[PDB]
């Protein structure tokens, strides 16, 4: 009755049904002879599971998962972990097309536990996974064929190659150029999924190319922004971020990174409208920190001054319609991610922010609430970047409106961060 509970558990029942899941195992670790009753009873168990199972309503399919999870990386079991390694497999296989969103990372993540649980059958599996995930991700401009797999086949795709890339790396090493080529051409895409986490498993491909540290590996950096120029040169709607997106992740520059997305960013500072940025806002906001990351011309002053330029629609209203501000909490956190990533850019000009701040913080509703939740931990970054300097403008105006405010943990967590920093208040 705990695993069906388990089953017709509730979404806000996860406590509950993990609970029980600890309850199932320590049942099971109670057993202390050699038999098989509780081998038959799991696997009748299992087969109800996969009989009622239902995937139109995104119920009583999790706990199948949740069974996969108590079954394995519970015991160093000689029987129990390696008979069971293709039946789960075969399930999650079974599962993963006829399933919803919010059930593919646990599908997964399980796989690629179970891809090296200790057993004997690994590589072939893997090649299996990665078989299907380049059948899947073939994909021709005429006589479209794989369109349909990019309802929800890709994502699964992508997120079987992140689990074999954070699960066995060395499998995965052969299949780079591969990826590269089978997420250049079809990167764009119907929704943000498949290109978030494309990008996603090309970091986790990035890092286990600096862990190899393979012979020259200028032929996958430079290859990587040849793509990335390739993509921005077609210039549409979702090409504009889906460089960014593939720009996310970087760390060695031997390309003019610094010089062709400044221009692109500034071109596309709006989307149609001043409101119509929802989708490349977060991602500009994200990828400044990371243009940040080599040079934002401190020396130069030729870049810092852009930066600042960049920032005054954004210093107020952003629509003409109805006079909102869907992006002044992220416009903070901008601000206070650069300070965080490199205090020197900011430090010549801080007094217009402290007037933005005094101007948010003069009254507050509920709206003001919501969006200076994060304003303390950027202000805490941007004092912690500042260092003892940051001495003037901390003199009054500022705590007492801090502290006239309903307590937070961001709050105290802010207060006690800016007081282990600069010794002067305590």
């Known amino acids: 009755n705990l695993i069906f509970d388990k089953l017709k558990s509730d979404v806000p029942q996860e406590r509950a049904s993990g609970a029980n899941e600890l309850s199932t195992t320590l049942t099971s670790l109670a057993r202390e002879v050699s038999a098989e009753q509780f081998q038959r009873f799991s696997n009748s168990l299992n087969n109800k599971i996969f009989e009622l199972i239902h995937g139109f309503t995104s119920s009583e399919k999790i706990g199948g998962i949740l069974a996969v999870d108590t079954l394995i990386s519970f015991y160093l079991s000689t029987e129990e972990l390696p008979n069971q390694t293709s039946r789960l497999a075969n399930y999650l296989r079974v599962l993963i097309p006829s399933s919803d969103i919010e059930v593919m990372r646990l599908a997964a993540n399980t796989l690629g536990r179970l891809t090296v649980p200790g057993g004997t059958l690994t590589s072939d599996f893997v090649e299996f996974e990665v078989r299907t995930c380049i059948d899947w991700l073939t994909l021709t401009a005429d006589n ?212 933005n701040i005094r101007e948010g913080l003069r009254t507050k509703f509920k709206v003001r609430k919501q969006f200076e939740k994060d304003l303390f931990y950027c202000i805490g970054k941007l004092a912690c970047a500042l260092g003892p300097a940051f001495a003037k403008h901390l003199n009054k105006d500022l705590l007492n409106l801090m502290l006239n405010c309903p307590m937070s943990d961001h709050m105290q967590e802010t207060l006690m961060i800016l007081n282990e920093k600069i010794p002067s208040l305590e």
């Open 144 to 355: 479209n064929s794989s369109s349909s797999k990019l309802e929800y086949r890709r994502h699964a795709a992508l997120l079987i190659i992140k689990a074999l890339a954070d699960n066995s790396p060395y499998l995965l090493y052969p299949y780079v150029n591969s990826i590269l080529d089978n997420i250049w051409v079809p990167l764009r895409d119907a929704k943000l999924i498949i290109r978030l986490d494309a990008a996603v498993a090309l970091g986790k491909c990035l890092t286990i190319i600096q862990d190899r540290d393979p012979a020259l590996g200028k032929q996958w950096f430079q290859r990587l922004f040849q793509g990335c120029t390739h993509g921005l040169s077609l210039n549409t709607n979702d090409s504009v971020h889906a460089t960014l997106l593939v720009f996310r992740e970087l760390l060695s520059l031997k390309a003019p990174y610094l010089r062709d997305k400044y221009d692109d960013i500034y071109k596309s500072t709006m989307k149609y409208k001043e409101y119509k940025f929802d989708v490349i806002r977060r991602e500009v906001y994200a990828i400044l920190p990371l243009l940040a990351a080599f040079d934002p011309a401190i020396f130069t002053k030729k870049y810092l001054d852009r930066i600042m330029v960049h920032y005054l629609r954004y210093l107020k209203n952003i629509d003409m319609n109805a006079a909102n501000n869907s992006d002044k909490p992220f416009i903070l956190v901008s601000i206070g991610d650069i300070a965080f990533e490199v205090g020197s850019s900011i430090s010549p000009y801080m007094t217009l922010i402290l007037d």
